[PDB]
C-alpha cells in the first residue's frame, strides 16, 4: 500500500484517544477497538488484520504525525499499541495454523513459562576504528550474530558495536499453552512461545490465563532446507480478557435449577449423576468426592488471615483393579480440572520449578499442574508417584496455598489453590488393616494429615458375598440402565457447579456450630486415657476441626445457602466419622498415625524397647552393646513385644534411623 | 558536550573542602546538590552521559591537585564518586531505558564474591614474533581474547601477566529489600561490580544505598536475550536509618494516647497475635516480649550486651508449628518466613557457595544475616543444615556469623531475634523424658533460647471446648472474635517506634525484687535439683534472660523506667519457661 494513504486515514479517525495518552507519557499505548475503527472506515479495520507488519507502523507514525503537527507539536507518545484490544476473531492454540502467519490475530490461553526482563538489542550500529564505516544492521529476537564479515569501504574486520547509538528495549519470553477449562476429554494441548517487548513485558506470571494479541511471525526459512518449526508470536497489545471469555458465561438454566433444588434428595441426585452407575459398592466414599467438587467460602481478613475451603480427598492402599481410577475420569466434571498423573513427564513436575530453555538462553520459570489449575481442581492418578524435588514443594502448595518457588533466584511464589482429588496405589500387592496409611505409602505423613477426607476401599475376600454382587450388577449392565442412570447430565451438573461456587455463599448458624463443637468435645473424652511414660493419643486434632467445617461448608453449598445448617452438619460429621472409623483409629481414635509415621502405641512400645536398649547400649555383652538376643528377653518379660514383634521393630528402627546393627545378634542405638 | 572545555567548567566548581582531607584517600565523594547550584545542565549530564562526564570529573581533580594554590604530589588514582542523585530507584525500576545512565538503586547485599584481581590493561604478546600489543579491557565487558596478530595474524597472541596492570575486582548481587516494594512483586536482582577503591566496602547483608551505571554483557547468540544488567558502581555508601525505619509520625498521637489506658499491657498481646487462636496466653506474652526486645547498649572498652530474647516454641506439630509464625511475620518489621530445610544453599546461616562465573568461593548470606533488626521466625528447626549448625551457636550468643571460608574471612552480623520452633525427633514427647535429649537440638543450644514454651493438644475438657467454640465463631465472622482492640497497622507502627526512642533503665526498687526471686530458687532447691553433675535451674546466664524480659515489659509501657511490679511481671514468665 501507499505510505501517506494509511497515515492520513488514521489521523482523521484518531483526538480524544491521544489526549489521554498525552497525560501519561510513560504508557505510550492506546486501547483501540475494532468496532470503533469499523464505524468510521470498514476497510481500515480489515487492512490491519491482513497486513500488520508495515500498516501498523505507518499508523503509529500517523499518531506521531498528529503529535508533530503545527498546532500540536508535543514530542510525546512516539510508540503506540496499534493492535486493537477488541478483535473480530479470537484464535486458539489448538486451532492455530500456518494460514495466519504474518497477520494480526488474538490468541487466548494460559501462560506456563516466563523469562527475566533483559535488554533487547535493536538497530545495532557498527563503526570501525581503522576504517570508520557508518552503517546500521537491524537485529531481530530470533536472529543470531547479525553482523557483516567486512566493511563496505576498506573491508575492515575489527568492527565495534555502539550501545549508546543503538536502541535498547525491554524483552521477555513467555510460553502460551491451552487453557484446561475449555479443554474437554481426549485433547492434547499444544504450546506456543511468545515474546514480550517494551511497555508490554511483566504483564502476567505463570499460572494464570492471559490474553495475547499481535502479529504472528515465524523463523526465516532458507532455500533448499527443511521447514523451520520455530514460530514466535509478537504480542503488541497488552490486555487481560481471556478470563471473561472462558470463566464468565451466561447460565440460562439457573431458573430451571431453582425448581430442581426446591425438591428433596437434591444432594443424593447430584452424587448419582456425577459418578458412573456401573461403578458400585461405595456410597459414603463417593459422597465425599462429590462434596469436594464444590468449594467453600474464601474471604480475606486483616493481618494476612485466611482460611482455605478446598477439601482434598486422597485414597491410599487401593486394589489393583479399582473403580476410583475410573471415577477419576468422572471426577473431571468439575471446572478448571486437569486429569494428569503425578509423574508429569517434565522437569517442573506438579509444582513450579525453573527449567532451562533451548530457544532462549535466559532462565525461565515453568508452571506445573498445581499452578496452572488455580481456582479449580487438579486430579492426580498417582499421588504416590512423584519426584523428590516436587515433594519438597507439595508441603507448602497444599497448606499455604502457594508454590513458594525460590530456587530460581527471583522468588516468584506462584499460587497453588486447587482442590486435589487424588489417589495412590499401594507398594504391595495387597492391602491389610494392620499396616497404617503412612507405612503403606511412599509419601510422607505430613501430606496425609492435610487431606480433609481419606478413604480406603476393599472388596470381600469370600466369593459367597463378593462375587454374587460384583458380577450381578455388571453382566446385566451391558446395554442397560444399570451401567448409567443419570437423572441429570454431566454437562448440566457442571453448569450448576459454576453458579454455586461463584454466586452462592452459605453460612452456618449458632445451632449448627454447636453441633460441630459438641461432637468434637464428646469424642475427645470418649477416647481420653492416661499414657504411662508418654502422651495419650488425641481423638480429633485442632487441625482436623477446621476440616470438619470445610465438609459442612461444602454440604451447605448444595443446601440453597440455608442459614440454619443443622441438617447438613450432621452428615458432615458422620462422613468424617466414617473415615475416622478405619483410618487414624490405631489405638483408640489415634490421630498420631495420620500426623506422624509412627502411631501412639508404636512409639510407646519403641520407647519401652529403648528402655531395654539404652540400659546396656554401652555395655557390650555380645558382639556389640545391647545384644538382640538379650533385648528380646528383656522386651518379652516386660511386655513390650514377642520375638516376632521385636524383629519387626528392630528393622523399623534401622529404616527410621533410631537403632542400627553392626552384626547379627546385636542392635546398638544410633 | 566537548570534554576539552568540560574540565574547565568543572574547574570553576572544584566539594573542595572534601579533597583536602581525602588526599591520602583514593575516592572523592562529590554531592550533586553542590554541582546543581553551579550548573544544572552539568548535573543532568551525569545521568544522561555517564561515560565521559565522570572521566572529565576524574581529570578535573588532577588539575586542582596541580594548581599553583593547591599543588600536591601528582596522584592519578582519584575516583570521581557521586553519592547524591536527585532520583532513587526501586526493585524493578531498572530497565532498558536506564542502560548507560547513572542511576541510584537502594537494596541489600545477598551474595558477594571473593577478592579477585582483574586485567584492566590487558597486554598481549605473541609467541612466534613477539608483538607488544596493548588493549584496555573494561570491567563491565565479558572475558574476551584477541583473534589474530596485528603483524602476522596467528593464534599465539596470549596475555602476559608481567607487563599487564591489574585492578581490584569484586562482584555482589544487589537483590533489593523485600519490604513489600512494587506491590509485593517478585524481587529482581541486578548483579554489580566493585572497583579498586570500592572493594570490601560492604559485607553481604547490610542496607546499602549504591549508585552505578547499568551496562550490558554479550552472553548468548540471540540478540534480544543476550543481556546482563551489570551495574558499574561509581559510589557505594550505607543506607540512612530514616529510609530503613518506618514513618511512625502519623501514628505518633495514637500511641501516646494508648499509654493513658491502663490496659496497654494486655492490648499489645492479644493484638500481636490473631484473636482466633484463643490459647497459649503465657506464650502470647512470650512472643510479645520477644518483639519488644531489650536495650542493645554497647558496654565500654569493647563489649556488647545481648538485647534479644529468642523464644523457643518447640512442641507437638498439631498446635505448634501452625499459624504462630505467620501472624507475627506480617506484624513485626523485617520478618522473613523461613523453614529449616530449604532448596537454597544458605538456608538459615550464611553458607558459602563455590559456583561462580569465575569459580571462586562466593558467600551467600542467609536469612539471619538479611534480617538486621528483624525476626527470622524459623519453622522446623530440627531439620536444619549441618553446615548451619556449626554457626548457629555463634549467632545466638554474639549475633555474628564468622564464616572463615576461602576468600571471605570477615564475619557477618546476624542481629536477628529468631523465634525458632521444631518437631520432636521421636514424636509425641512428654515430661517423663528429659527435654534437651529427646530433641534434635543440643542441650548447649537450648540454653541460648531465653524462653522455651511447650505446646501440645491436651485432652482436657475446657481446652478442647475453647478451641471448638472460638474456631466456629471466627468462621461465621463475628467482630468480637476477629477484630482486635487496636488495629494491626497501628501495632506494627507501635513496635518500630518504641525501639527507637524509649529505653528502659534499671531502678532501685526493681533490682530488689530480683534479689528475693534469685535467692529463693537456689536455697536448697539448687542441691535438690542437681545430682552433682546435673545442670543448675537458674544460673548467671538465666539472669540475663530475666532482665531482658524486665526491659521487654517496660517497652510495652514505654515508661522508660522499670519498677517492682514491672519486674514481677518478668518473674512469672521466667517461671513458666522452667515449669513448662
Author numbering:
A (entry chain F): 1 to 14, 27 to 682
B (entry chain E): 1 to 14, 29 to 594
Publication passage describing the model:
We developed an affinity-grid method employing monodispersed single particle streptavidin on a lipid monolayer to enhance particle absorption on the grid surface and alleviate sample exposure to the air-water interface. Here we generated streptavidin affinity grids with monodispersed single particle streptavidin (mspSA) on lipid monolayers, which allowed for high-resolution structure determination of challenging samples. Affinity grids could alleviate both issues by enriching the particles on to the grid and keeping them away from the AWI. Taken together, we developed mspSA affinity method which enabled the structure determination of archaea MCM and in complex with dsDNA, HIV-1 CA Di-hexamer and ScPol II EC, while providing essential insights into DNA replication initiation.
